[PDB]
Amino acid sequence: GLVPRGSHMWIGVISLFPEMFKAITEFGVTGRAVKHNLLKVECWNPRDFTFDKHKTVDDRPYGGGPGMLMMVQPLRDAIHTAKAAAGEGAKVIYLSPQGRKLDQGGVTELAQNQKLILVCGRYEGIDERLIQTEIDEEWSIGDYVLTGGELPAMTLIDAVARFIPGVLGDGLLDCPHYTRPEVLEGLTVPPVLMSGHHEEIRKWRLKQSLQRTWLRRPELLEGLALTDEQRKLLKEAQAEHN
Amino acid sequence: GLVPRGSHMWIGVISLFPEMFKAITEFGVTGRAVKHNLLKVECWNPRDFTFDKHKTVDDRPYGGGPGMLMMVQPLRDAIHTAKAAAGEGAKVIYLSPQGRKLDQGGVTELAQNQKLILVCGRYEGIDERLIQTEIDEEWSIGDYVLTGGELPAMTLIDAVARFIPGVLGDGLLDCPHYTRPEVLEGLTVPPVLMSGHHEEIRKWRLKQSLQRTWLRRPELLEGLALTDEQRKLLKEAQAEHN
Numbered sequence: 001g002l003v004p005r006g007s008h009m010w011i012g013v014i015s016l017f018p019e020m021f022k023a024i025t026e027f028g029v030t031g032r033a034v035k036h037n038l039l040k041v042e043c044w045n046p047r048d049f050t051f052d053k054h055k056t057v058d059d060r061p062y063g064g065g066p067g068m069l070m071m072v073q074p075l076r077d078a079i080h081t082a083k084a085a086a087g088e089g090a091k092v093i094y095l096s097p098q099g100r101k102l103d104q105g106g107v108t109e110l111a112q113n114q115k116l117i118l119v120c121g122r123y124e125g126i127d128e129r130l131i132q133t134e135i136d137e138e139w140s141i142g143d144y145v146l147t148g149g150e151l152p153a154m155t156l157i158d159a160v161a162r163f164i165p166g167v168l169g170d171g172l173l174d175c176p177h178y179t180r181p182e183v184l185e186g187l188t189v190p191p192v193l194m195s196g197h198h199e200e201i202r203k204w205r206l207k208q209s210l211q212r213t214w215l216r217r218p219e220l221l222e223g224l225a226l227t228d229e230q231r232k233l234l235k236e237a238q239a240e241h242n
Numbered sequence: 243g244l245v246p247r248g249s250h251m252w253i254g255v256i257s258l259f260p261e262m263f264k265a266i267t268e269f270g271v272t273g274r275a276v277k278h279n280l281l282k283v284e285c286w287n288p289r290d291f292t293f294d295k296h297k298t299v300d301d302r303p304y305g306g307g308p309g310m311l312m313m314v315q316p317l318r319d320a321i322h323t324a325k326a327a328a329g330e331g332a333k334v335i336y337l338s339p340q341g342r343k344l345d346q347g348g349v350t351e352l353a354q355n356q357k358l359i360l361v362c363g364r365y366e367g368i369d370e371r372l373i374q375t376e377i378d379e380e381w382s383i384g385d386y387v388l389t390g391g392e393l394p395a396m397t398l399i400d401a402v403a404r405f406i407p408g409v410l411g412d413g414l415l416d417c418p419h420y421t422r423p424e425v426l427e428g429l430t431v432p433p434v435l436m437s438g439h440h441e442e443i444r445k446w447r448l449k450q451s452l453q454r455t456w457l458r459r460p461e462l463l464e465g466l467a468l469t470d471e472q473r474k475l476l477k478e479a480q481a482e483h484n
């Protein structure tokens with residue numbers, strides 16, 4: 001083993017649909033991280049924490065209306081069981097539309113936790129008091145309406161898994177990518193990429209990355225003090241663009 | 243049948259990992275939309291469009307480096323097959339970090355398409371010229387780094403599926419939710435929700451929704467001309483908060 005013990009990442013998941021998480025535990029990079037014991041994902045289903053005959057996991061809101069909520073007791077007890085399995089040091093995160101917006105900076109923070117517990121909401125969500133009593137942080141992957149927190153949870157897992165030691169193995173938008181063939185339906189590859197001049201290629205790729213970031217996500221540049229070369233190349237691209 | 247024919251939604255998916263999409267075709271609302279033939283998700287794997295013995299689906303970039311790309315030919319041919327199955331009127335979308343930021347307004351646009359083709363990238367992504375020749379629009383679910391476009395694609399599907407006629411059955415942040423019990427670890431439900439005065443409950447919920455939106459996602463209010471009642475309640479919440 002090249003990777004030290006205690007650097008593996010453990011992620012507890014609370015969800016009404018545990019089998020959804022096969023999408024990340026059995027495929028791609030995260031699937032290989034699980035297979036090589038670098039990442040462990042353990043799911044608990046609130047349905048297993050009910051006591052009525054029909055395993056009711058939703059409840060009606062105080063004040064009335066069609067907006068169903070997750071039943072507090074089965075959800076709370078699932079979280080407590082996850083906390084027990086995790087031991088001390090587990091951060092409990094609720095995937096939530098009203099959470100702090102997830103960005104790469106936020107991902108970097110969350111990835112510093114060896115133990116995470118992710119709570120996935122269904123219906124209209126969870127009781128507000130559970131957030132105060134059980135939840136440490138709320139996070140959102142975007143401003144749009146979904147039907148569950150499972151997909152955002154898997155997104156979070158996918159993003160933090162890249163930080164696990166032993167996996168593979170800088171946040172700015174990528175330069176345009178080119179692979180075979182040399183001419184695709186009449187469209188040619190930029191000659192510099194065919195040139196074999198790797199110092200020229202390096203400068204070109206960096207410049208194209210800065211320009212594209214500037215044009216499509218200028219906000220990403222607002223939290224960075226760019227290097228002298230990057231500032232020089234960006235200024236060139238800005239002048240050439242206009 | 244209560245739902246008219248031709249209102250069902252068809253979504254073609256291009257992905258190296260088709261089985262991941264069981265997460266949305268077999269569970270929750272989207273799973274029920276598929277089971278009731280309101281939503282159809284059809285996947286094509288670029289691996290089935292290779293011709294070498296080992297079904298190679300990645301390629302090396304012009305200019306060198308460790309950044310692998312999707313091989314153009316198998317990906318392109320999968321897209322063409324999806325286009326053929328869809329017929330005319332299918333919009334091809336590439337799930338991309340450099341795409342237009344997905345929000346609920348953007349979701350509403352995409353949901354106006356009866357036919358969608360979603361292209362999921364792996365590795366460092368796809369050839370730039372394929373975007374020009376095959377892709378209609380690029381979309382991003384957020385500014386953070388992932389390992390694949392499948393999860394964003396499933397997020398998009400989940401969000402647009404809510405617009406399908408026959409499914410269930412306003413974008414602002416929700417008011418705090420409360421369900422049983424009345425007192426949770428000492429924390430009580432706001433008395434108005436217990437009161438049975440539904441006109442008071444209506445005003446309270448609306449006010450709490452506006453205040454929370456104002457405090458956590460003030461940008462969501464910037465594209466709306468609020469109603470007289472909403473402006474009145476928001477002004478009250480703002481004054482009370484400060």
Ligand SMILES: Cc1cccc(C(=O)NCC2(NC(=O)c3cccc4nocc34)CCCC2)c1
Nearest residue numbers: 095096097121122125140141145146147148152
């Ligand atoms: C803008 C807005 C306002 C009001 C409701 C909703 C909404 O989508 N409510 C539905 C639920 N949404 C999410 O969990 C959810 C959704 C989106 C991104 C996310 N990132 O993490 C969890 C996320 C709430 C619990 C069950 C599903 C969205």
Ligand SMILES: Cc1cccc(C(=O)NCC2(NC(=O)c3cccc4nocc34)CCCC2)c1
Nearest residue numbers: 337338339363364367382383387388389390394
């Ligand atoms: C900010 C930034 C800069 C540079 C690279 C990346 C990055 O994550 N590159 C890796 C890939 N990311 C996505 O596809 C992807 C990622 C995130 C949201 C998305 N919404 O749709 C598709 C999405 C590109 C193709 C294969 C995976 C991200």
